[PDB]
Design a protein around this ligand. Structure first.
Ligand SMILES: [Ca+2]
Length: 336
């Protein structure tokens, strides 16, 4: 017989390699006797990155008895409200893409994340920049949920690490405004810029505008830049190191290269680990009643995954060493 886990993701509209990590993992689990003798099967639901469809899917998984746990969703604006539904149903929701601090700030007991939050990434960036001797910086943020969340965290940890935020701003109307801003920043003694704007939503246009004006200081960004050559030197805080020395990572990278003909993405890796994580917790619990699964996950760790060690706190955040800092160099990522 079978055990099912649901996956909620914008499958059709995305080519992120996430489904390929999933497929690879399921395969590996089944070809070793599966889980408790049972074969593992995914029930895929496409949320189209739309809140209405996201919520309907969450609902549908909640009142389907065969579902042990759900993996998803990709977007924080869907995951936060969807978590409400899984938590009320006693169903474990394990998210591999949603970085918002707010996801684990509501006392939900069955809600999990297998990647570092925007907050943990921001903290590691602050530590790194300060260790490099960065003293005075400027933040470029967007006034929305992601922008504010990431900017806020970085401001905090930056002060905690000795860095002065000399300026923050969320708008410039044209290149001469950016020229005026930069004159001001030079007077402040700015030595770096943190971009808390998504890459597709204003981040990259700013990269271009900033080169064009003559800005020389290092540039730093968050997760949404893991997904042209003027980004040289851009430091990105993300996760998954495909050059991590351990045999667990190299086996995965090799197996993936073989089957798919390209290196894995961090979403593919997050996908892979989520399935293995859930299967491994599942091999140890009572499938009779899937709300023992949550406590299962908090005693599972540490669990060696393709991304590094996984360990959950009581809020459900992943708090193992998983943040990977990446610098752009000649088109590809270097790892520090
Ligand atoms: Ca200082």
């Amino acid at each position: 017989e079978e055990i099912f886990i649901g996956v909620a993701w914008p499958f059709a509209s995305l080519d992120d390699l996430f489904a390929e990590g999933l497929e690879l993992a399921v395969q590996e689990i089944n070809e070793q006797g599966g889980v408790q003798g049972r074969k593992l099967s995914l029930v895929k639901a496409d949320d189209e990155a739309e809140l209405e469809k996201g919520l309907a899917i969450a609902q549908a998984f909640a009142d389907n008895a065969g579902i042990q746990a759900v993996i998803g969703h990709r977007n924080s604006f869907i995951s936060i409200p969807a978590a409400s539904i899984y938590d009320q149903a006693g169903l474990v929701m394990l998210s591999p893409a949603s970085t918002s601090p707010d996801l684990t700030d509501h006392g939900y007991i069955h809600v999990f994340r297998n990647i570092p939050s925007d907050q943990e990434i921001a903290r590691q960036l602050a530590i790194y920049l300060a260790e490099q001797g960065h003293e005075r910086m400027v933040i470029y943020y967007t006034d929305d949920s992601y922008g504010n969340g990431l900017a806020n965290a970085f401001e905090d940890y930056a002060r905690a690490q000795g860095i002065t935020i000399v300026d923050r701003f969320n708008y410039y109307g044209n290149l001469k405004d950016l020229e005026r801003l930069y004159d001001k920043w030079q007077a402040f003694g700015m030595d770096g810029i943190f971009i808390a704007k998504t890459a597709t939503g204003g981040g990259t246009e700013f990269l271009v505008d900033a080169k064009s004006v003559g800005i020389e200081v290092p540039l730093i960004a968050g997760n949404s830049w893991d997904a042209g050559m003027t980004a040289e030197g851009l430091l990105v805080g993300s996760f998954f190191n495909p050059q991590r020395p351990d045999s667990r990572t190299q086996d995965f990278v090799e197996a993936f290269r073989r089957e798919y003909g390209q290196p894995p993405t961090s979403y593919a890796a997050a996908g892979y680990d989520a399935v293995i994580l859930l299967a491994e917790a599942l091999e140890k619990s009572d499938l009779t009643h899937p709300a023992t699964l949550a406590q299962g996950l908090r005693d599972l760790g540490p669990w060696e995954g393709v991304m590094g060690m996984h360990r959950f706190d009581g809020r459900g955040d992943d708090i193992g060493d998983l943040v990977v800092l990446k610098k752009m160099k000649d088109g590809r990522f270097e790892y520090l």
